[PDB]
C-alpha cells in the first residue's frame, strides 16, 4: 500500500504540476492582459494588483 501510495502520489503530483503550471500561464496571461490593459487604460491599477 505504501509504495503504491507514493507512486500514485507522484503521478498525481506530476499532473498537479502540469495543472498549476498551466494555471501560471493563465495567471501570467491574465496579468499581462492587465499590464497591456492598464497601459492603454481599459483596466485599472487595482485590477492589475
Amino acid at each position: 500500500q505504501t509504495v503504491r501510495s507514493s507512486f500514485n502520489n507522484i503521478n498525481a503530483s506530476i499532473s498537479s504540476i502540469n495543472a498549476y503550471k498551466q494555471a501560471v500561464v493563465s495567471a501570467q496571461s491574465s496579468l499581462d492582459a492587465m499590464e497591456a490593459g492598464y497601459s492603454v487604460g481599459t483596466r485599472t491599477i487595482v485590477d492589475v494588483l
Partner: protein
Amino acid sequence: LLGTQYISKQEYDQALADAQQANAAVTAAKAAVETARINLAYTKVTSPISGRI
C-alpha cells in the same frame, strides 16, 4: 480618481463622454427653448423699424 486607482481612464473617459455628450444635449435643448422663445415673445409689435404706426 484619475491617476490614482480605480477609475481605469477609459471608464473615466466613458463618463467624460457622457458629460461632454449630455452638455451638448443641453445645447440642443437650450436652443430648443430658444426656438420656442422666439415663437413666444415673438408677438409682435413692431416690425423693427421705429416710426409712425
